[PDB]
Every structure is written in C-alpha cells, then in structure tokens.
mmCIF file of C-alpha atoms and ligand atoms in Angstrom:
data_model
loop_
_atom_site.group_PDB
_atom_site.id
_atom_site.type_symbol
_atom_site.label_atom_id
_atom_site.label_comp_id
_atom_site.label_asym_id
_atom_site.label_seq_id
_atom_site.Cartn_x
_atom_site.Cartn_y
_atom_site.Cartn_z
ATOM 1 C CA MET E 438 -3.238 7.132 -0.303
ATOM 2 C CA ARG E 439 -0.125 6.779 -2.608
ATOM 3 C CA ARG E 440 1.330 3.330 -1.923
ATOM 4 C CA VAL E 441 4.758 1.688 -2.041
ATOM 5 C CA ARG E 442 6.132 -1.594 -3.372
ATOM 6 C CA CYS E 443 5.664 -4.645 -1.000
ATOM 7 C CA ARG E 444 9.071 -6.201 -2.115
ATOM 8 C CA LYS E 445 7.541 -9.718 -1.521
ATOM 9 C CA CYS E 446 5.141 -10.533 -4.439
ATOM 10 C CA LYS E 447 5.893 -12.360 -7.772
ATOM 11 C CA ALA E 448 6.136 -8.924 -9.574
ATOM 12 C CA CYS E 449 8.484 -7.335 -6.953
ATOM 13 C CA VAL E 450 11.067 -10.224 -6.792
ATOM 14 C CA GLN E 451 11.269 -10.291 -10.665
ATOM 15 C CA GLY E 452 14.300 -8.449 -12.131
ATOM 16 C CA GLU E 453 13.893 -5.542 -14.628
ATOM 17 C CA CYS E 454 13.377 -7.160 -18.085
ATOM 18 C CA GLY E 455 15.402 -4.435 -19.944
ATOM 19 C CA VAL E 456 13.199 -4.706 -23.085
ATOM 20 C CA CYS E 457 9.707 -3.237 -22.215
ATOM 21 C CA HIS E 458 8.893 0.443 -23.030
ATOM 22 C CA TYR E 459 9.466 1.499 -19.355
ATOM 23 C CA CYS E 460 12.887 -0.296 -19.083
ATOM 24 C CA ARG E 461 14.042 1.138 -22.482
ATOM 25 C CA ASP E 462 13.275 4.666 -21.112
ATOM 26 C CA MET E 463 15.488 4.133 -17.977
ATOM 27 C CA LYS E 464 18.941 5.805 -17.803
ATOM 28 C CA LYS E 465 20.546 2.407 -16.827
ATOM 29 C CA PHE E 466 19.338 1.025 -20.228
ATOM 30 C CA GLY E 467 20.495 4.162 -22.126
ATOM 31 C CA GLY E 468 17.110 5.952 -22.260
ATOM 32 C CA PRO E 469 16.171 9.597 -21.433
ATOM 33 C CA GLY E 470 14.739 8.722 -17.992
ATOM 34 C CA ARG E 471 11.693 11.029 -18.124
ATOM 35 C CA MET E 472 8.847 8.446 -17.551
ATOM 36 C CA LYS E 473 10.219 7.282 -14.104
ATOM 37 C CA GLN E 474 7.928 4.208 -14.168
ATOM 38 C CA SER E 475 8.793 0.701 -13.096
ATOM 39 C CA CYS E 476 9.346 -2.273 -15.485
ATOM 40 C CA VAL E 477 5.923 -3.502 -16.779
ATOM 41 C CA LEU E 478 6.782 -6.983 -15.238
ATOM 42 C CA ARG E 479 7.440 -5.463 -11.756
ATOM 43 C CA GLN E 480 4.052 -3.773 -11.112
ATOM 44 C CA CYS E 481 3.416 -4.673 -7.371
ATOM 45 C CA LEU E 482 0.426 -7.032 -6.878
ATOM 46 C CA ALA E 483 -0.160 -5.892 -3.252
ATOM 47 C CA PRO E 484 1.184 -2.303 -2.608
ATOM 48 C CA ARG E 485 1.622 -1.223 1.036
ATOM 49 C CA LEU E 486 1.090 2.062 2.893
ATOM 50 C CA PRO E 487 4.361 4.065 3.473
ATOM 51 C CA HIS E 488 6.001 3.717 6.948
ATOM 52 C CA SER E 489 5.498 7.524 7.558
ATOM 53 C CA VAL E 490 1.641 7.234 7.526
ATOM 54 C CA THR E 491 -0.005 8.015 10.931
ATOM 55 C CA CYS E 492 -3.391 7.358 12.675
ATOM 56 C CA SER E 493 -5.964 10.223 12.254
ATOM 57 C CA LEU E 494 -6.982 9.938 15.954
ATOM 58 C CA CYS E 495 -3.678 9.488 17.899
ATOM 59 C CA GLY E 496 -1.048 10.588 15.320
ATOM 60 C CA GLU E 497 1.099 7.441 15.832
ATOM 61 C CA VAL E 498 2.579 5.194 13.068
ATOM 62 C CA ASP E 499 1.750 1.464 12.376
ATOM 63 C CA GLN E 500 3.102 -0.521 15.382
ATOM 64 C CA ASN E 501 2.204 -4.076 14.141
ATOM 65 C CA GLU E 502 5.872 -4.925 13.162
ATOM 66 C CA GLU E 503 6.765 -5.098 16.921
ATOM 67 C CA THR E 504 3.326 -5.570 18.686
ATOM 68 C CA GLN E 505 1.890 -8.316 16.303
ATOM 69 C CA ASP E 506 -1.726 -7.083 17.047
ATOM 70 C CA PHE E 507 -4.432 -6.209 14.375
ATOM 71 C CA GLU E 508 -5.610 -3.225 16.548
ATOM 72 C CA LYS E 509 -1.998 -1.716 16.407
ATOM 73 C CA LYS E 510 -2.015 -1.958 12.552
ATOM 74 C CA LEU E 511 -2.960 1.033 10.462
ATOM 75 C CA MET E 512 -6.073 0.478 8.310
ATOM 76 C CA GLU E 513 -7.136 2.628 5.378
ATOM 77 C CA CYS E 514 -10.861 2.914 4.559
ATOM 78 C CA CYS E 515 -11.520 2.406 0.814
ATOM 79 C CA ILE E 516 -14.781 4.449 1.272
ATOM 80 C CA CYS E 517 -13.876 7.495 3.498
ATOM 81 C CA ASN E 518 -9.992 7.279 2.968
ATOM 82 C CA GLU E 519 -9.423 7.609 6.781
ATOM 83 C CA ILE E 520 -6.298 5.889 8.210
ATOM 84 C CA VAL E 521 -6.776 4.697 11.820
ATOM 85 C CA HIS E 522 -5.728 2.028 14.324
ATOM 86 C CA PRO E 523 -8.804 -0.269 14.661
ATOM 87 C CA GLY E 524 -8.220 -0.004 18.462
ATOM 88 C CA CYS E 525 -8.541 3.824 18.394
ATOM 89 C CA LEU E 526 -12.179 3.613 17.040
ATOM 90 C CA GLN E 527 -14.824 4.271 19.767
ATOM 91 C CA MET E 528 -17.726 2.305 18.139
ATOM 92 C CA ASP E 529 -18.565 -1.439 17.697
ATOM 93 C CA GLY E 530 -18.126 -3.392 14.452
ATOM 94 C CA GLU E 531 -15.456 -5.372 12.581
ATOM 95 C CA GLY E 532 -15.794 -3.484 9.270
ATOM 96 C CA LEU E 533 -15.237 -5.275 5.921
ATOM 97 C CA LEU E 534 -11.689 -6.455 5.090
ATOM 98 C CA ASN E 535 -10.461 -5.824 1.510
ATOM 99 C CA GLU E 536 -8.688 -8.945 0.142
ATOM 100 C CA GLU E 537 -7.154 -7.065 -2.885
ATOM 101 C CA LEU E 538 -4.953 -4.577 -0.898
ATOM 102 C CA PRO E 539 -3.150 -4.987 2.495
ATOM 103 C CA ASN E 540 -4.165 -2.638 5.441
ATOM 104 C CA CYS E 541 -7.433 -1.884 3.611
ATOM 105 C CA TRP E 542 -11.107 -2.215 4.612
ATOM 106 C CA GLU E 543 -14.558 -0.611 4.709
ATOM 107 C CA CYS E 544 -14.227 0.843 8.228
ATOM 108 C CA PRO E 545 -16.941 0.281 11.015
ATOM 109 C CA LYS E 546 -18.316 3.845 10.309
ATOM 110 C CA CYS E 547 -18.757 3.124 6.547
ATOM 111 C CA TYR E 548 -19.750 -0.586 6.958
HETATM 112 ZN ZN1 ZN F 713 10.928 -4.053 -18.183
HETATM 113 ZN ZN1 ZN F 714 4.859 -6.365 -4.543
HETATM 114 ZN ZN1 ZN F 715 -4.414 5.459 16.618
HETATM 115 ZN ZN1 ZN F 716 -14.762 4.580 6.393
#
C-alpha cells in the first residue's frame, strides 16, 4: 500500500529548494531532521509500488521490466487492496484502470 517515488515526474526530477519548511528541517540544511519529509516541490505525482511487493496468488514479484506484458505486471485494487498479476486471476473481465496512479485499478472481482 505504501508507495515509493517514481524518479521520472516533474516533481521527482526537481532539486530540493532548500527554503520550504520541510527542506529547512533537513540535517543537510542545518535543521533538526525530525520531520523526515521530502521537499514540498518534490512530492511525486505518480508514486509506484515497491519492488519487494508480491502477487497474492503466486507469491512472485512484478516481472514486467523483463517480460513487457500487462499480465506479468502487478496490479493493486483501489477497492479490495489486493495485489495480483492480471494473468493469475481465474475469472473474465478487464477491470477498470486508474489513470491517477500506476499499477492501480478496480480489479475484475470489484468491477
Ligand atoms: Zn524544499
Ligand atoms: Zn515522481
Ligand atoms: Zn501472480
Ligand atoms: Zn478488487
């Protein structure tokens, strides 16, 4: 559920501003370092699932980086929170793709 920085978007490629309340708190800018939050200007526009996340049905990781196949991707359901390979699902249906987050949909069980 907790996502990571995509490193590609307009927010990610932007350097730390050094002047917002989150930058001023960082140790590198002479602050106490207790907040541990990113620069306000670097809040990822499309956060991704961590590489350690596995399919609920087969227990394997996302294999799309090598396979280049949608069914080998990991998809997270924004309704039931289940993380599966579309190909591991035993019923019909395309589900409903979420355009706000990557690897996110309303799965064929929920939609
Ligand atoms: Zn900043
Ligand atoms: Zn990003
Ligand atoms: Zn699977
Ligand atoms: Zn679902």
